[PDB]
Amino acid sequence: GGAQQRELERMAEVLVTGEQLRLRLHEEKVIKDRRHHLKTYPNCFVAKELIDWLIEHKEASDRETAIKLMQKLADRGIIHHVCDEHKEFKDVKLFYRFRKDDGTFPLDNEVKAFMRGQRLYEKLMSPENTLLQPREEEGVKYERTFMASEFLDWLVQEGEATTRKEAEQLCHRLMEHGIIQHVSSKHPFVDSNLLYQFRMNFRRRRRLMEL
Amino acid sequence: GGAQQRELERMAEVLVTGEQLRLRLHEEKVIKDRRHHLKTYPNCFVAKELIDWLIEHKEASDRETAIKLMQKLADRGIIHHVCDEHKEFKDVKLFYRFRKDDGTFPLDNEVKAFMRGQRLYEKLMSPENTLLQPREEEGVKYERTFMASEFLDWLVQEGEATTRKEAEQLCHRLMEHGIIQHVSSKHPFVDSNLLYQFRMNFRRRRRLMEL
């Protein structure tokens, strides 16, 4: 994997693990609409309460390390402090901002392809999936291959792409960013019976303490 | 105009007029990175100062009506009060929220197509543009037509689409949502010499006072 995989892991894993946490906290009602002074702030958690929860569910060893983990999510824009935004515009010396000027947290195309590729790899490495097999091309045995045509077929049936031409562009992006490769000759992706492999050998999703 | 156009105008015109204000306020440095107690708040304006500016530039007769106009923008999420979001996560009773749980302002495909079409229509009404002409098809005279092939050429040349097939898909959306039409309702959009028109007769951009 090397430097590319290390840096793509840095970019992507906290986003993946952070999203997993968000879903868990909704299911457990730690995130909910909260009222404070007759004012409703929707879909909020309380910092102290989340620290409690993290330790309570053995996601963090102590208060100090739970704070460090949530700080990492705050630093990457995954969570933010909810301050009191006045809803009423008034003739006062307060700062205002156009929503279009709000800061964003965009992902470049390499990171997007990495994160798409990891979802596919996890599905294809599951017992239920059988696309990945040792196969032969021009008399060479290769491990963990998939056929270009079969991969395009599966991408649609699973709903990872709407159409074959859409799924084809996805594979070209996966090729461009080194997520997949032709079994031997750096050949491009072609809708054919040629064999391809994952170049990127993704590691399991991180737990919170592993960030 | 009719019912479809009235409701698409309600959805879109405040967004266009508000965006135009954002660009103008940037040009005039009413929006800029502002410092407040050793914390830099980027791309902000000061409410009172914008009221000043609106009156100075005759967008509002008085402060009360200028406030009413900016409230309209705030109500549609175009502007918001910038409050102090603590960057450091602390073991405190403060509300936090996942960014993915922040409120959003989605636009459906019909409004997007309406807004795309209005931008294209304005460009085709610029003095240097010559795409729109009276032309004849199957012996019938039509006004304000454009040819599909010429329109696709221009859409790519103008950068409204990266590629010719992307420009083609845009036109299909314009047909789907009644923004453009075939001169005689006999064909979909086809990359060819067939003639098309704007079905939507867009009205001039709203002034702030008209929203």
Residue numbers in the entry:
A (entry chain B), B (entry chain A): 20 to 230
Quoted from the paper:
DEPTOR is a 46 kDa protein comprising an N-terminal DEP (Dishevelled, Egl-10, and Pleckstrin) domain tandem, herein referred to as DEPt, and a C-terminal PDZ (postsynaptic density 95, disks large, zonula occludens-1) domain. Biochemical analysis and cryo-EM reconstructions of DEPTOR bound to human mTOR complex 1 (mTORC1) and mTORC2 reveal that both structured regions of DEPTOR, the PDZ domain and the DEP domain tandem (DEPt), are involved in mTOR interaction.
(b) The DEPt of DEP domain-containing mTOR interacting protein (DEPTOR) crystallized as a domain-swapped dimer. The domain-swapped dimer is stabilized by a non-native disulfide bridge between C102 of the protomers. DEP1 of DEPt, which mainly mediates interaction of DEPt and mTOR, is more conserved than DEP2. The two positively charged patches in DEPt were recently described to bind to phosphatidic acid (PA).
